Ligand binder design. Structure first.
Ligand SMILES: CCc1oc2cc(S(=O)(=O)Nc3ccc(S(N)(=O)=O)cc3)ccc2c1C(=O)c1cc(Br)c(O)c(Br)c1
Ligand SMILES: [Mg+2]
Length: 282
């Protein structure tokens, strides 16, 4: 498998850091002027992780349509994803407004609320059925309908209600809970299983709005998820699957949101997931 051979060549030459730096250097650079406006200071989690202006998701509210989220539109693969930061104490309402307005079916969370002893995002969904959440600023109700805790992930059914119209929708929350505090998973086995569990649910499908993906910053683990998914989809679609170049796909995705894949380790892991995903397929 051509990409496997490249993988093995980089391993042997110990050139993961160099390949990764090359991607960093070639990556797109677009303005994030809205993200930097003084009034949006409290809507951003990380100073160095902002959505580009051209691909940012706009809230359908008048005056301050800003949320730290980007639409990644993969034309050839015919897949779209919304990558966003983990919600802040003051942006949970915005987060669900976006889910509502973008017509998303699924939310993909790749972090734990607390990792390395620090808070990585707000507790933005209800943990108990009888204790629903109301987001007064965006007039939305959120109810935990069911929860299925598995080994490497937890899937939740949530009901999102637009209080203005009393319209309701079912949202699936796919929560990968086993990404290690340091480095990356030893085997891509569980992450691929998880990705295919998300696929199974219809959350990535054309009949729904784009899936909403986040980790703490919405670029590292999040990038890995969308990158693996897109590469595998392209391998199924093309007459020549060996033509799928992960570096090129990653560079295309970076036209839509900065920093996707934060480390050389994450790049290596992304190759691994794509290689093993293809081998399983087979
Ligand atoms: C393609 C998705 C996928 O890729 C995987 C890769 C591994 S692996 O890392 O352990 N590698 C691997 C395992 C087994 C084979 S096999 N059975 O072909 O010899 C090949 C490769 C494990 C599990 C999976 C795995 C799945 O769990 C999975 C889950 C669901 Br739901 C699916 O519908 C599919 Br198809 C696959
Ligand atoms: Mg209970």
């Amino acid at each position: 498998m051509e990409m496997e051979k490249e993988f093995e060549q980089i391993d042997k030459s110990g050139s993961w850091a160099a390949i990764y730096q090359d991607i960093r250097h070639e990556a797109s650079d677009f303005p994030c002027r809205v993200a930097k406006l003084p009034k949006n200071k409290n809507r951003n989690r990380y100073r160095d992780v902002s959505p580009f202006d051209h691909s940012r998701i706009k809230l359908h509210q008048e005056d301050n349509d800003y949320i730290n989220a980007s639409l990644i539109k993969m034309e050839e693969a015919q897949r779209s994803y919304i990558l966003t930061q983990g919600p802040l104490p003051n942006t949970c309402g915005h987060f669900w407004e976006m889910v509502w307005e973008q017509k998303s079916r699924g939310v993909v969370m790749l972090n734990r609320v607390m990792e390395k002893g620090s808070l990585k995002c707000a507790q933005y969904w209800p943990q108990k059925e009888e204790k629903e959440m109301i987001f007064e600023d965006t007039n939305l109700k959120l109810t935990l309908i069911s929860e299925d805790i598995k080994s490497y992930y937890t899937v939740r059914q949530l009901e999102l209600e637009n209080l203005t119209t009393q319209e309701t929708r079912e949202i699936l929350h796919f929560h990968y809970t086993t990404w290690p505090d340091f480095g990356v998973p030893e085997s891509p086995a569980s992450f691929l299983n998880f990705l295919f569990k998300v696929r199974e649910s219809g959350s990535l499908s054309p009949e729904h709005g784009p899936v909403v993906v986040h980790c703490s910053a919405g670029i590292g683990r999040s990038g890995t998820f969308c990158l693996a998914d897109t590469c595998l989809l392209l391998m199924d679609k093309r007459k020549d699957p060996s033509s799928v170049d992960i570096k090129k796909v990653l560079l295309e995705m970076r036209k839509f949101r900065m920093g996707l894949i934060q480390t050389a380790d994450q790049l290596r892991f992304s190759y691994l997931a794509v290689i093993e995903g293809a081998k399983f397929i087979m």
